[PDB]
Design a protein around this ligand. Structure first.
Ligand SMILES: [Hg+2]
Ligand SMILES: [Hg+2]
Length: 493
């Protein structure tokens, strides 16, 4: 994790998401890495909404994304909007026309694309300055002919880097902007956006994934043409997880086709779904922090992330107990007449202590005789088709959970839930599609019955059922009825 130029109190980084949907696991990495540099260098972290486009971006997701940031426990020092700088950006666009480093172009898109591939020059590239300015005021006044034009930088159509072949800087859009309204009929591209905004806002270290290394040459070009200050660009590897798709489009297919109950479904790779599934922020930051800025294309097994999480939650989760209900058998031990206040984590005493006479067990337990936990039974006989077993007792001697059917503390309606990937093929692609690797049954519910110290579970508490594994309370119990829903936390393999 070596950062060139990084001095204490002088690092300024930014997370620049566009308010067009939910944040996902990939966004969570970019954001957690930025936080890392903010925290380690006592620098500024700027959150900036990319709002250059008046269409796709909606202020409803603005709330969604801020709540997503918060639940990752990321605490930005300043919040901004690209549109805060529309006036400055346009003055730089105009500066460039004036110097002959930009030109306006009405060339139809298909033909523009074909010229770029064959490194050809546009019929407009050599417009004199006043003609460009004429076509520019056309664009600025939102006219029907200007809506067919394009503003382009004058770089190098012979470049090996497609990014240097006269990129578009400004396009014509007649939609009102949410914040600037109808003041502007023309709007900057992202490619003209980052350099100037990162420079005005003082950003020192601009993080990107390796996929966009071609843009750097173009950015430094913009930055040198204007003479503004130049941030470092710092790169890291994007997140390639098996069985996973991130595309907004492909995820909303799962939403419409009703295989997933919403954008925070625990099977979804959104920040919400991952957390609701049992991921902790500490587990995520750790796995992120083991990455640092590794820069390698690598297919990721989710279970590597869930392993870091197991190490987080295991030394702190309290151990309760649950059993089913349609495979349970009554028991009679006649030697105990009422509560033992035993611990809740066998090793760390600081987690707390929980409270636990003559009546249950389960089906699968009813066949595996002379040990109990937090407690050595020797059973009389099994009266048969098993539906009852009675026993005697004695604590002197030598691996079994049980729920006493005491009237004092009755037991809580529980549901254990389990999930697996919606996509059954790990590393899928090679012009294939996911739409036909669907784990068409991806959820199972199993009605159960749990220890009374489950009456008090809050949504988000992480416990450990004994003999089953780690769970997360999806919804609490409340006095029909409403069960305490517990979701199975993958432990990584
Ligand atoms: Hg264009
Ligand atoms: Hg490019």
């Amino acid at each position: 994790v070596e950062l060139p130029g990084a001095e204490m109190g002088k690092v300024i980084v930014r997370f620049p998401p566009e308010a067009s949907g939910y944040l996902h696991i990939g966004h969570a990495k970019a954001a957690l890495l930025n936080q890392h540099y903010q925290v380690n260098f006592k620098g500024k972290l700027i959150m900036r909404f990319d709002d250059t486009n008046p269409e796709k971006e909606k202020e409803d997701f603005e709330k969604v994304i801020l709540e997503d940031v918060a639940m990752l426990h990321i605490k930005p020092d300043q919040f901004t909007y690209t549109s805060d700088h529309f006036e400055t950006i346009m003055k730089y666009a105009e500066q460039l026309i004036q110097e002959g480093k930009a030109y306006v172009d009405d060339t139809p898109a298909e033909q523009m694309k074909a010229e770029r591939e064959q490194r050809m020059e546009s019929k407009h590239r050599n417009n004199c300055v006043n003609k460009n300015l004429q076509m520019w005021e056309e664009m600025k006044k939102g006219t029907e002919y200007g809506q067919t034009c394009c503003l382009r930088a004058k770089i190098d159509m012979n470049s090996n880097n497609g990014c240097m072949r006269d990129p578009t800087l400004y396009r014509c859009k007649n939609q009102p902007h949410p914040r600037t309204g109808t003041t502007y009929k023309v709007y900057p591209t992202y490619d003209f956006a980052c350099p100037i905004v990162d420079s005005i806002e003082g950003v020192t270290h601009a993080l990107r994934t390796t996929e966009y290394h071609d843009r750097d040459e173009q950015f430094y070009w913009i930055i040198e043409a204007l003479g503004i200050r130049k941030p470092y660009i710092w790169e890291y590897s994007r997140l390639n997880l098996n069985n996973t798709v991130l595309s907004k489009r492909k995820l909303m297919w799962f939403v419409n086709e009703g295989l997933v109950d919403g954008w925070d479904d625990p099977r979804f790779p959104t920040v919400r779904g991952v957390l609701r599934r049992g991921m902790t922020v500490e587990g995520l930051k750790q796995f992120i922090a083991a990455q640092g800025s590794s820069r390698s294309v690598v297919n990721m097994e989710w279970d590597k992330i869930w392993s870091f999480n197991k190490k987080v939650i295991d030394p702190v989760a309290p151990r309760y107990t649950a059993l089913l209900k349609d495979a349970v058998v009554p028991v009679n031990v006649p030697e105990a007449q009422e509560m033992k206040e035993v611990a809740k984590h066998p090793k760390n005493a600081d987690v707390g202590l929980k409270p636990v006479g003559s009546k249950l067990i389960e089906g699968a337990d009813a066949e595996t005789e002379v040990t109990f936990i937090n407690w050595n039974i020797i059973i009389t006989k099994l009266n048969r088709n098993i539906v009852s077993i009675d026993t005697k007792l004695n604590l002197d001697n030598k691996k079994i959970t049980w729920l006493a059917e005491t009237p004092r503390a009755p037991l809580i309606p529980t549901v254990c839930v389990n999930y697996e990937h919606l996509i059954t093929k790990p590393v899928l692609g090679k012009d294939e599609d996911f739409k036909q690797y669907i784990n068409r049954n991806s959820k199972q519910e199993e009605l159960m019955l749990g220890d009374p110290c489950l009456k008090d579970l809050k949504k988000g508490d992480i416990i450990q059922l004994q003999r089953r594994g780690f769970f997360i309370c999806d919804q609490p119990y409340e006095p029909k009825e409403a069960p305490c829903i517990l979701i199975y936390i993958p432990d990584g393999h």
